[PDB]
Design a protein around this ligand. Structure first.
Ligand SMILES: O=P(O)(O)OC[C@H]1O[C@H](OP(=O)(O)OP(=O)(O)O)[C@H](O)[C@@H]1O
Ligand SMILES: O=P(O)(O)OC[C@H]1O[C@H](OP(=O)(O)OP(=O)(O)O)[C@H](O)[C@@H]1O
Ligand SMILES: Nc1ncnc2[nH]cnc12
Ligand SMILES: Nc1ncnc2[nH]cnc12
Ligand SMILES: [Mg+2]
Ligand SMILES: [Mg+2]
Lengths: 178, 178
């Protein structure tokens, strides 16, 4: 697939960042090449319409790199984008959810009024690894009584079993690495 | 039908966040209303094309809220988007710059190969306050021998004199509050 290859060719790999033995998958060249970025958004939007038709109310973008994709995906789909942030950044009443990031704890947060009960949401981030970030986002949304239709990413690291962590919430990635 | 009123009406202002006496300008409802977001990007893109014509090579989006705008703005201008991140997030060779942020010091960073010498860039962030974040971004870009044509934001807090801190780099905001 030509559109898929536009994206795949613009992932840059950096061994041993941030820690030895790992490979960091850098999306920066995707954002830097307008045809690549457009291709990534189009592939996501196409899959989502093919899977949910008109049922998606909102995209939820995950702080920070998910913010690079959320608004553009929402726009392509004719939808608004809600924000899920790292804790301490959002004004107004909030809820938060901890997850394991690196060697300690991080927390995501959402405004209590971000969604109404029963609203249907697709979560986007750049990359699924352990699924801790995405899972925390789903927890937040469920605690607003929102329905998470699917989570999606550009990249998925399959050996980390992020997909299983999210299950039964469906998951879709453009690209898969070990 | 004022496009600018579409954006203005979707700024939510929270008193005393994060500290007493401060008014937080929350862009969240802009993102959540696809017509508001579309209007915001269109206004920015129109200003930028009217001001710089074909001179812009890239948009630079500032971590984290500037990431909400950079890619869509770049897409609208048919340009790529490069990233300026909080220090510690980017792989490979980087440059970093300190700045004063609240009561302490923060650092922004950029990959050394984000831009080549002589490339021209417009920096986008959601909000200009003291100008410290934007100013650090300009310093980083200048160190890659990139030319900063302008910096732009949705919101500008004019009593903080951010515009003066950026001078002689030009600055444009959609909306102004004391
Ligand atoms: O599946 P996980 O193991 O939770 O990792 C995936 C998350 O990690 C990265 O975010 P990070 O916490 O590095 O912050 P960033 O978005 O500022 O890069 C990435 O953008 C995902 O949000
Ligand atoms: O003009 P200044 O006084 O530097 O303030 C403006 C900056 O502050 C905010 O970011 P923040 O540092 O809160 O991080 P965020 O983008 O993750 O919210 C905002 O998005 C700008 O980047
Ligand atoms: N290898 C990786 N590259 C980029 N972001 C990540 N988040 C978790 N693992 C990552
Ligand atoms: N008043 C304010 N509202 C939102 N973001 C900000 N960043 C700096 N000052 C701010
Ligand atoms: Mg992230
Ligand atoms: Mg910011």
């Amino acid at each position: 697939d030509s559109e898929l290859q536009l994206v795949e060719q613009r992932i840059r790999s950096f061994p041993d960042f941030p820690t030895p033995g790992v490979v960091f998958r850098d999306i920066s060249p995707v954002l830097k090449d307008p045809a690549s970025f457009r291709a990534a958004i189009g592939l996501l939007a196409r899959h989502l319409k093919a899977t949910h038709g008109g049922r998606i109310d909102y995209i939820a973008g995950l702080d920070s790199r998910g913010f690079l994709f959320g608004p553009s995906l929402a726009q392509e789909l004719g939808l608004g984008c809600v924000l899920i942030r790292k804790r301490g950044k959002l004004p107004g009443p909030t809820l938060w959810a901890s997850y394991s990031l690196e060697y300690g704890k991080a927390e995501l947060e959402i405004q209590k009024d971000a969604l109404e009960p029963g609203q249907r949401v697709v979560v986007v981030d750049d990359l699924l690894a352990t699924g801790g970030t995405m899972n925390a986002a789903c927890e937040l949304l469920g605690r607003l009584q929102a329905e998470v239709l699917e989570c999606v990413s550009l990249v998925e690291l399959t050996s980390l079993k992020g997909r299983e962590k999210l299950a039964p919430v469906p998951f879709f990635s453009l690209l898969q690495y070990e």
